[PDB]
Design a protein around this motif. Structure first.
Motif, short mmCIF file in Angstrom:
data_model
loop_
_atom_site.label_atom_id
_atom_site.label_comp_id
_atom_site.label_asym_id
_atom_site.label_seq_id
_atom_site.Cartn_x
_atom_site.Cartn_y
_atom_site.Cartn_z
N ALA A 218 -2.26 -5.19 9.03
CA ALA A 218 -1.40 -5.62 8.04
C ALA A 218 -0.50 -4.19 8.40
CB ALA A 218 -2.23 -5.04 6.70
N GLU A 219 -0.95 -2.95 8.53
CA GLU A 219 0.65 -2.52 8.63
C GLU A 219 1.69 -2.83 9.87
OE1 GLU A 219 0.52 0.61 7.58
OE2 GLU A 219 2.56 1.00 8.19
N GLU A 220 1.43 -3.52 10.79
CA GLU A 220 2.29 -4.02 11.73
C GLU A 220 3.13 -4.86 11.38
OE1 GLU A 220 1.04 -4.67 15.61
OE2 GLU A 220 2.09 -6.47 16.08
N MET A 221 2.88 -5.33 10.28
CA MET A 221 3.04 -6.74 9.79
C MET A 221 4.04 -6.17 8.28
SD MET A 221 1.08 -10.10 11.47
CE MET A 221 2.64 -10.88 11.17
N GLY A 222 3.21 -5.23 7.66
CA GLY A 222 4.21 -4.97 6.58
C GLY A 222 3.45 -5.98 5.06
N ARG A 223 2.49 -6.62 5.31
CA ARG A 223 1.69 -6.69 4.41
C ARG A 223 0.06 -5.80 3.90
NH1 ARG A 223 3.59 -12.17 5.51
NH2 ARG A 223 5.27 -11.67 6.26
N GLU A 224 -0.63 -6.91 2.97
CA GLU A 224 -2.04 -5.90 2.67
C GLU A 224 -2.76 -6.39 2.23
OE1 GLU A 224 -0.40 -4.72 -1.37
OE2 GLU A 224 -0.60 -2.92 -0.71
N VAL A 225 -4.48 -5.40 3.13
CA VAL A 225 -5.76 -6.31 2.89
C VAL A 225 -6.42 -5.44 1.96
CG1 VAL A 225 -7.90 -4.89 4.39
CG2 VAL A 225 -6.17 -5.83 6.03
N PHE A 226 -7.14 -6.80 1.41
CA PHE A 226 -7.84 -6.20 0.11
C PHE A 226 -9.94 -6.44 0.88
CE2 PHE A 226 -4.47 -7.63 -2.65
CZ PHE A 226 -5.38 -7.56 -3.45
N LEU A 227 -10.60 -5.09 0.34
CA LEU A 227 -12.01 -5.56 1.32
C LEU A 227 -12.67 -5.70 -0.20
CD1 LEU A 227 -13.55 -4.44 3.31
CD2 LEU A 227 -13.54 -2.39 2.21
N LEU A 228 -13.85 -6.87 0.74
CA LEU A 228 -15.07 -7.15 0.10
C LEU A 228 -16.14 -5.95 0.07
CD1 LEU A 228 -16.04 -8.86 -2.16
CD2 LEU A 228 -15.54 -10.83 0.24
N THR A 229 -16.39 -5.90 -1.25
CA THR A 229 -17.41 -5.07 -1.15
C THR A 229 -18.73 -5.89 -1.68
OG1 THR A 229 -17.64 -3.77 -2.98
CG2 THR A 229 -16.23 -2.78 -2.01
N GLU A 230 -19.01 -5.62 -3.03
CA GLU A 230 -20.22 -6.88 -2.91
C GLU A 230 -19.98 -8.25 -3.61
OE1 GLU A 230 -23.04 -4.15 -5.38
OE2 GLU A 230 -23.80 -7.15 -6.28
#
Ligand SMILES: O=c1cc(O)n([C@@H]2O[C@H](COP(=O)(O)O)[C@@H](O)[C@H]2O)c(=O)[nH]1
Ligand SMILES: O=c1cc(O)n([C@@H]2O[C@H](COP(=O)(O)O)[C@@H](O)[C@H]2O)c(=O)[nH]1
Lengths: 218, 220
Positions: B106-118
């Protein structure tokens, strides 16, 4: 399930031409291919029918299904419509999510493989501590097909103990991740191998070499 | 953070291209952020992301619940961003290396990660719930800025908001069909995710409008 040479090819090349070529080069050694999201998201779900047309191999869709029951059912439907024979499902999201997959597989004449413990280091953080309970959940649900880690033979052996000798167990992490083909086959019915074959100079020789190393197990 | 119109994200889980396109088009005046998952992508191809961008203004969150080893996670993220997704949703339960792999792409490509928790469904109570606080803490330690947590368990959604802090971005599914309340959920989440309550309505526009009317005092 009768896997030729107890060897399942993990076809994670992302280019259709390469994926078809490399699979073709090892076709005499295998009759079962695991196709995952790297290839499917790059080349489309039509790639599954193409593999069946070209090789007549069985196809395991390694989609690590990990959603709510409603969504899991849809994912399984789309996957089997594309011609997959089986689908790999995470156990960590719980029983209802697994049941949703079991139900669709039954309706479409397919199999669910339950992934219990994973092969990579991060599996130790949360998955490993739940893995035995996930396996018992599989048994309770009537799951007959399982996935466990080549990289931790003691954990793979424990998984085998839980599910019994009648259940079917396949195991990734062989080769690139450090798992040994022969040791893994003490416990698993079949080994999954990706990079050690498909990144080799000579994939045919790579597959031949692995098989030679386990010849007394065949 | 992404500026989600009306704090409302459409979960477009229709599996037919024509219906998916029609419904999304009908709610375009109310929603500029669409979550596209595997039901639609496995039915119509990754090009569907392209078609949504072409047809509608909308941002696209690829809800792929990425849950593999680091090597495979990297490939999935690369393919997904190449196709035009603004963001991808990744499971935390497979551990830190798996999450890190996604963050790196995501950093390399200029995008974002959403982390699924519960997760929002009943089965989440078996294994995920007990790990969820730690998964969230892990996310914070890894520098994750965007999170997903469950509308169906307000007490858990509140705790997850505490863990990630007020600066983090939090979106929440389970509103409507699964029983979560839009207003209650927006006490803690920046945006709500809504699927069936909108896309199975006789008039999806009216359904979206109704949800938005009900939370009108919570808009920025
Ligand atoms: O615990 C698991 C479960 C998997 O499905 N896999 C999958 O098995 C394959 C292993 O490939 P390789 O032999 O190149 O390490 C990959 O497709 C990966 O996604 C794994 O490595 N570990
Ligand atoms: O914990 C979670 C995480 C999700 O992504 N989802 C997703 O959010 C959407 C919820 O849709 P719905 O409003 O029809 O219940 C679905 O796409 C589902 O896969 C969820 O329901 N619970």
């Amino acid at each position: 399930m009768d896997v030729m040479n107890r060897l399942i090819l993990a076809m994670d090349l992302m280019n259709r031409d390469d994926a078809l070529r490399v699979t073709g080069e090892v076709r005499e050694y295998i009759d079962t291919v695991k196709i995952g999201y790297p290839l499917v998201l790059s080349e489309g779900m039509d790639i599954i029918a193409e593999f069946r047309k070209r090789f007549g191999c069985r196809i395991i869709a390694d989609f690590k299904v990990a959603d709510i029951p409603e969504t899991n059912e849809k994912i399984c439907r789309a996957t089997f419509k594309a011609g997959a024979d089986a689908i790999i499902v995470h156990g960590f999201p719980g029983a209802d999510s697994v049941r949703a997959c079991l139900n669709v597989a039954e309706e479409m004449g397919r199999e669910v493989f339950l992934l219990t413990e994973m092969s990579h280091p991060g599996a130790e953080m949360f998955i490993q501590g739940a893995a035995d309970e996930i396996a018992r959940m599989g048994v309770d649900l009537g799951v007959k097909n399982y996935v466990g880690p080549s990289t931790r033979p003691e954990r793979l052996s424990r998984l085998r103990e839980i599910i019994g000798q009648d259940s079917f167990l396949i195991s990734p992490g062989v080769g690139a991740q450090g798992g040994d083909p022969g040791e893994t086959l003490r416990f698993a019915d079949a080994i999954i191998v990706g990079r050690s074959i498909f990144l080799a100079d000579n994939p045919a020789a790579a597959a031949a070499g692995i098989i030679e190393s386990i010849k007394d197990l065949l």
